[PDB]
Design an enzyme around this catalytic site. Structure first.
Site, PDB file in Angstrom:
ATOM      1  N   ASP A   1      -7.201   1.157  -7.518  1.00 57.90           N
ATOM      2  CA  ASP A   1      -6.050   0.278  -7.314  1.00 57.90           C
ATOM      3  C   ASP A   1      -5.863  -0.721  -8.449  1.00 57.90           C
ATOM      4  O   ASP A   1      -6.474  -1.781  -8.443  1.00 57.90           O
ATOM      5  CB  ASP A   1      -6.228  -0.474  -6.002  1.00 57.90           C
ATOM      6  CG  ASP A   1      -4.987  -1.271  -5.601  1.00 57.90           C
ATOM      7  OD1 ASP A   1      -3.993  -1.283  -6.339  1.00 57.90           O
ATOM      8  OD2 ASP A   1      -5.033  -1.869  -4.527  1.00 57.90           O
ATOM      9  N   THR A   2      -4.966  -0.410  -9.379  1.00 60.16           N
ATOM     10  CA  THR A   2      -4.721  -1.292 -10.532  1.00 60.16           C
ATOM     11  C   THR A   2      -4.073  -2.607 -10.119  1.00 60.16           C
ATOM     12  O   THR A   2      -4.091  -3.580 -10.864  1.00 60.16           O
ATOM     13  CB  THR A   2      -3.861  -0.603 -11.617  1.00 60.16           C
ATOM     14  OG1 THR A   2      -2.592  -0.206 -11.063  1.00 60.16           O
ATOM     15  CG2 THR A   2      -4.585   0.640 -12.170  1.00 60.16           C
ATOM     16  N   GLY A   3      -3.501  -2.636  -8.920  1.00 56.75           N
ATOM     17  CA  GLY A   3      -2.812  -3.809  -8.429  1.00 56.75           C
ATOM     18  C   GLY A   3      -3.723  -4.797  -7.729  1.00 56.75           C
ATOM     19  O   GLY A   3      -3.282  -5.876  -7.334  1.00 56.75           O
TER      20      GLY A   3
HETATM   21  C1  ROC Z   1       2.693  -3.282  -1.996  1.00 55.81           C
HETATM   22  C2  ROC Z   1       2.566  -2.232  -0.902  1.00 55.81           C
HETATM   23  C3  ROC Z   1       3.556  -1.119  -1.202  1.00 55.81           C
HETATM   24  C4  ROC Z   1       2.912  -2.847   0.441  1.00 55.81           C
HETATM   25  N1  ROC Z   1       1.215  -1.691  -0.907  1.00 55.81           N
HETATM   26  C5  ROC Z   1       0.112  -2.382  -0.625  1.00 55.81           C
HETATM   27  O1  ROC Z   1       0.052  -3.564  -0.303  1.00 55.81           O
HETATM   28  C6  ROC Z   1      -1.133  -1.560  -0.696  1.00 55.81           C
HETATM   29  C7  ROC Z   1      -1.582  -1.308   0.735  1.00 55.81           C
HETATM   30  C8  ROC Z   1      -2.853  -0.476   0.751  1.00 55.81           C
HETATM   31  C9  ROC Z   1      -3.289  -0.316   2.195  1.00 55.81           C
HETATM   32  C10 ROC Z   1      -3.628  -1.681   2.772  1.00 55.81           C
HETATM   33  C11 ROC Z   1      -4.793  -2.294   2.003  1.00 55.81           C
HETATM   34  C12 ROC Z   1      -4.426  -2.466   0.532  1.00 55.81           C
HETATM   35  C13 ROC Z   1      -3.929  -1.158  -0.083  1.00 55.81           C
HETATM   36  C14 ROC Z   1      -3.410  -1.428  -1.491  1.00 55.81           C
HETATM   37  N2  ROC Z   1      -2.184  -2.243  -1.464  1.00 55.81           N
HETATM   38  C15 ROC Z   1      -1.730  -2.421  -2.852  1.00 55.81           C
HETATM   39  C16 ROC Z   1      -2.597  -3.480  -3.534  1.00 55.81           C
HETATM   40  O2  ROC Z   1      -2.583  -3.256  -4.944  1.00 55.81           O
HETATM   41  C17 ROC Z   1      -2.145  -4.907  -3.237  1.00 55.81           C
HETATM   42  C18 ROC Z   1      -0.872  -5.216  -4.024  1.00 55.81           C
HETATM   43  C19 ROC Z   1      -0.560  -6.687  -3.949  1.00 55.81           C
HETATM   44  C20 ROC Z   1      -0.844  -7.511  -5.036  1.00 55.81           C
HETATM   45  C21 ROC Z   1      -0.555  -8.867  -4.954  1.00 55.81           C
HETATM   46  C22 ROC Z   1       0.023  -9.390  -3.806  1.00 55.81           C
HETATM   47  C23 ROC Z   1       0.314  -8.568  -2.724  1.00 55.81           C
HETATM   48  C24 ROC Z   1       0.020  -7.212  -2.798  1.00 55.81           C
HETATM   49  N3  ROC Z   1      -3.191  -5.789  -3.765  1.00 55.81           N
HETATM   50  C25 ROC Z   1      -3.972  -6.523  -2.960  1.00 55.81           C
HETATM   51  O3  ROC Z   1      -3.853  -6.538  -1.746  1.00 55.81           O
HETATM   52  C26 ROC Z   1      -5.005  -7.397  -3.612  1.00 55.81           C
HETATM   53  C27 ROC Z   1      -6.158  -7.678  -2.662  1.00 55.81           C
HETATM   54  C28 ROC Z   1      -7.128  -8.555  -3.414  1.00 55.81           C
HETATM   55  N4  ROC Z   1      -7.163  -9.830  -3.035  1.00 55.81           N
HETATM   56  O4  ROC Z   1      -7.807  -8.102  -4.326  1.00 55.81           O
HETATM   57  N5  ROC Z   1      -4.378  -8.681  -3.880  1.00 55.81           N
HETATM   58  C29 ROC Z   1      -4.349  -9.210  -5.092  1.00 55.81           C
HETATM   59  O5  ROC Z   1      -4.894  -8.677  -6.039  1.00 55.81           O
HETATM   60  C30 ROC Z   1      -3.639 -10.526  -5.220  1.00 55.81           C
HETATM   61  C31 ROC Z   1      -3.541 -11.201  -6.434  1.00 55.81           C
HETATM   62  C32 ROC Z   1      -2.868 -12.417  -6.477  1.00 55.81           C
HETATM   63  C33 ROC Z   1      -2.312 -12.931  -5.305  1.00 55.81           C
HETATM   64  C34 ROC Z   1      -1.628 -14.144  -5.316  1.00 55.81           C
HETATM   65  C35 ROC Z   1      -1.080 -14.636  -4.137  1.00 55.81           C
HETATM   66  C36 ROC Z   1      -1.202 -13.923  -2.948  1.00 55.81           C
HETATM   67  C37 ROC Z   1      -1.883 -12.714  -2.937  1.00 55.81           C
HETATM   68  C38 ROC Z   1      -2.433 -12.223  -4.117  1.00 55.81           C
HETATM   69  N6  ROC Z   1      -3.091 -11.049  -4.101  1.00 55.81           N
END
Ligand code: ROC
EC number: 3.4.23.16
Length: 198
Positions: free
Chosen positions: A124-126
């Site tokens: 997960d690059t995000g």
């Molecule tokens: C965006 C969407 C299409 C809804 N997809 C997703 O959300 C999927 C869902 C999958 C199943 C549920 C569990 C997570 C995975 C991966 N995620 C993608 C995944 O890449 C998700 C994207 C993201 C980034 C930032 C803010 C919100 C959302 N990242 C994350 O959830 C990681 C978790 C972590 N703390 O390491 N969040 C962050 O890296 C991160 C960074 C900065 C922030 C600043 C403010 C608030 C929140 C912040 N979260």
């Protein structure tokens, strides 16, 4: 270009006549943008992530330019803290994950071994951090809260944990708690030399 993961993989996008920054997110099935002005009809939709769910507006057949590369697809708009480009658009700009090479037509899953146990997880690059479903790990840990698209969750923080990612060894911080999906974030992706290529 090729992109390493020591920093968040941000790109410039143009959409609806406007310029924005967004995160190249292999862990996201969909593309989700902060509230903004787009023209045309849309449909209500609910989407989930860590923290819970959010309501968004679904726009189909939207033209978007991602770092100069054009794509047309579905864009969701609503209360996300960060603009994310998910796999639905990444495939159109020929994005690959390399560490083997991996295309993004399907979720980029790998096998991990951690605490003596085999599991599957999402590259997960995000994700800044690595977050695993509840499991048995040995040792001390510290409480912590982390945010995602639907809010926050409480996790246990294990440091200096050995993990094998598709046969590649890394040591670093692993968070454990109520995530629906095991995610391998950039803190570990750098250690196995993962790059994005498009
Ligand atoms: C965006 C969407 C299409 C809804 N997809 C997703 O959300 C999927 C869902 C999958 C199943 C549920 C569990 C997570 C995975 C991966 N995620 C993608 C995944 O890449 C998700 C994207 C993201 C980034 C930032 C803010 C919100 C959302 N990242 C994350 O959830 C990681 C978790 C972590 N703390 O390491 N969040 C962050 O890296 C991160 C960074 C900065 C922030 C600043 C403010 C608030 C929140 C912040 N979260």
């Amino acid at each position: 270009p090729q992109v390493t993961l020591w920093q968040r993989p941000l790109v410039t996008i143009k959409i609806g006549g406007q310029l924005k920054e967004a995160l190249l997110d292999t862990g996201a099935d969909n593309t989700v943008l902060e509230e903004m002005s787009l023209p045309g009809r849309w449909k209500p939709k609910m989407i989930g992530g860590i923290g819970g769910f959010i309501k968004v507006r679904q726009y189909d057949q939207i033209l978007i330019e991602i770092c100069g590369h054009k794509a047309i697809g579905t864009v969701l708009v609503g209360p996300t803290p960060v603009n994310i480009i998910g796999r639905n658009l990444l495939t159109q700009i020929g994005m690959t994950l390399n560490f083997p090479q991996v295309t993004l037509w399907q979720r980029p899953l790998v096998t991990i071994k951690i605490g003596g146990q085999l599991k599957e997880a999402l590259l997960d690059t995000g994700a800044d951090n690595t977050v695993l479903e509840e499991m048995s790990l040995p040792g001390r840990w510290k409480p912590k809260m982390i945010g995602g698209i639907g809010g926050f969750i409480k996790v246990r923080q294990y440091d200096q944990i050995l993990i094998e990612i598709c046969g590649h060894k890394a040591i670093g911080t692993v968070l454990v708690g109520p995530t629906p999906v095991n995610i391998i974030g950039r803190n570990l992706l750098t250690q196995i030399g993962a790059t994005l290529n498009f």
